[PDB]
Amino acid sequence: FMVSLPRMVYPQPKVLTPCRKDVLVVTPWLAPIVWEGTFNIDILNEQFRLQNTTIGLTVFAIKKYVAFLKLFLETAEKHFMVGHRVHYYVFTDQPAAVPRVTLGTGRQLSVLEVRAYKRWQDVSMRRMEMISCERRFLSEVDYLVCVDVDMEFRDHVGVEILTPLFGTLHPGFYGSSREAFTYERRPQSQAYIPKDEGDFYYMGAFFGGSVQEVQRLTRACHQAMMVDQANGIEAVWHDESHLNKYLLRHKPTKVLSPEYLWDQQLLGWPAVLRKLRFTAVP
Ligand SMILES: O=c1ccn([C@@H]2O[C@H](COP(=O)(O)OP(=O)(O)O)[C@@H](O)[C@H]2O)c(=O)[nH]1
Ligand SMILES: [Mn+2]
What we know:
Elements: E1 33-34, H1 41-49, E2 54-61, H2 69-79, E3 85-92, E4 107-113, H3 120-125, H4 127-131, H5 134-140, E5 143-147, E6 151-153, E7 165-168, E8 206-210, H6 211-230, H7 238-249, E9 254-256, H8 264-267, E10 278-280
Parallel strand pairs: 1-9, 2-3, 2-5, 3-4, 7-9
Antiparallel strand pairs: 5-8, 6-10, 7-8
The chain binds uridine-5'-diphosphate and manganese (II) ion.
Uridine-5'-diphosphate (UDP) is lined by residues 60-63, 65, 120, 123-124, 148-150, 205.
């Protein structure tokens, strides 16, 4: 049950004037594509605070990648879901190397010890098995957000992203034709997508949704990866390839623009990006 919003004063949305004319702001299945200028954060914050929303953030820091946690967490404290309840879940092979980062009120961090795989490919992929922790998330958070650690927040990432299931447009492919998408192209793989299929190329570094939908996605991807392994094939881009197959066949209910996953070193700062929110660390 949802209580009424309070009286709020804000500019009237004008039907005969788009918020953005330069970009697609809704998919053909009527999912919003989240860009700066498309949302009033005050309205959204009200809607989500009235539900006492808790957001879980999962992040893997294995072997040398523990070095990225301090900046990741400090910047998340400045920019990620500020004002809302947040539970970070840090999955690591080195619990003692997790930095002691000072957290704001209503925010907590759990360190979860996992095994370290030799191959970075396996480390990256095996994130699906670990996320699929099932009993824990259901009791503790409403939404799960799954991100890479070699990153920093530079601007607001908030409740505008929350929805049953979301993916993020990969910054290298948002302007590309589908034939250029680096989907898995071998029919022998469960991740296979033909040249005439595909909506978007989503990045493995930022996806999420409700706990139920995220655990459906991660279970499905893990099972598909196990089939591939049994068949002696490894998808070209690992769990990202599987994530893309899943989101082709199960359309996300929001899509995040590349504001939400950017690499300024490789791609600069195009005019179409009004904000750079969450960016790669060299
Ligand atoms: O040795 C490793 C390799 C990978 N990862 C995790 O898997 C994610 C994806 O790998 P990576 O960031 O290297 O992929 P890329 O962004 O370079 O494509 C990393 O962000 C980490 O969260 C890790 O913790 N230790
Ligand atoms: Mn990364």
